[PDB]
Design a protein around this ligand. Structure first.
Ligand SMILES: [Ca+2]
Lengths: 223, 63
């Protein structure tokens, strides 16, 4: 997250880190046994790490649970990034407490102008790279469909939205993929892609979770 | 020339536009060696291999 701020320990209790020896992507816990992330984060060997703040030290009260299943959306297209969503099933249920808690799925789509919270352990620089120890947060509004398509002509599908600041300085970045975009206490978005990070007229692009609630519920039911 | 290893091996690293940190390998022409990088998960270019071995084999000889 570029241009954001230190969340504080366990203030985003649904944020997870996806580990394959190292943190490769984030994720959102939607119930005791299931995490939502991005399809481009797919890996056969994932360990979900819940209740993290500093991902570089083991404090002793995190929960580290293997993923038993990682199910990418069946219509995911790796060239267009359409349907960039994946569900991860935990081997065993997490213990929910104040530091590990699920986030609700949306019951409507969020409109342009709504403020969201975007979070993750990604790059905090727009030039070069610096990866933080502790979780970073950014407040950002949903952008209008018109301004998103203007920014990225020919690239925005119906299952994508833009959020952030067209002036630059504040965006999600590499290392944040798969993490949450939360508006009014619902999961409205998944970190996906952008042209660079925190650049002028190139806002973050996010998977529109409200479009997938049926798929999410039936995947969970059937697996 | 066709199947030309230089056309792949001599390209600069490209993290691409997706926002992951996936461990991959690339040929670095200034060290003449296969090095690791963290790929964003989509697009980029062909100088992008899953393993050091794959890179080493692909870039074994450069004309
Ligand atoms: Ca930790």
């Amino acid at each position: 997250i570029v241009g954001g701020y230190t969340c504080g320990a366990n203030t985003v209790p649904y944020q997870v880190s996806l580990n394959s020896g190292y943190h490769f992507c984030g994720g959102s816990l939607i119930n005791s046994q299931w995490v939502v992330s991005a399809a481009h984060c797919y890996k056969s060997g994932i360990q979900v790490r819940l209740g993290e703040d500093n991902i570089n030290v083991v404090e002793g009260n995190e929960q580290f649970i293997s993923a038993s299943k990682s199910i990418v959306h069946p219509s995911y297209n790796s060239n267009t990034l359409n349907n960039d969503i994946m569900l991860i099933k935990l081997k065993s249920a997490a213990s929910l407490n104040s530091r590990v808690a699920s986030i609700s799925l949306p019951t409507s789509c969020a409109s342009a102008g709504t403020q969201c919270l975007i979070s993750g352990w990604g790059n905090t620089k727009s030039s070069g790279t610096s990866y933080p120890d502790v979780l970073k947060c950014l407040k950002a509004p949903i952008l209008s469909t018109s301004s998103c398509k203007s920014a990225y002509p020919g690239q925005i599908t119906s299952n994508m939205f833009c959020a952030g600041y067209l002036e630059g300085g504040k965006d999600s970045c590499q290392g944040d993929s798969g993490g949450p975009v939360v508006c009014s206490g619902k999961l409205q978005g998944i970190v996906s892609w952008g042209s660079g990070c925190a650049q002028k007229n190139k806002p973050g692009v996010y998977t529109k979770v409200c479009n997938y609630v049926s798929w999410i519920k039936q995947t969970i039911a059937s697996n | 020339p066709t199947g030309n290893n230089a056309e792949i091996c001599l390209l600069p690293l490209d993290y691409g536009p997706c926002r992951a940190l996936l461990l991959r390998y690339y040929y670095d022409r200034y060290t003449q060696s296969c090095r690791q990088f963290l790929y964003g998960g989509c697009e980029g270019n062909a100088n992008n291999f899953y393993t050091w071995e794959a890179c080493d084999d692909a870039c074994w000889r450069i004309e």
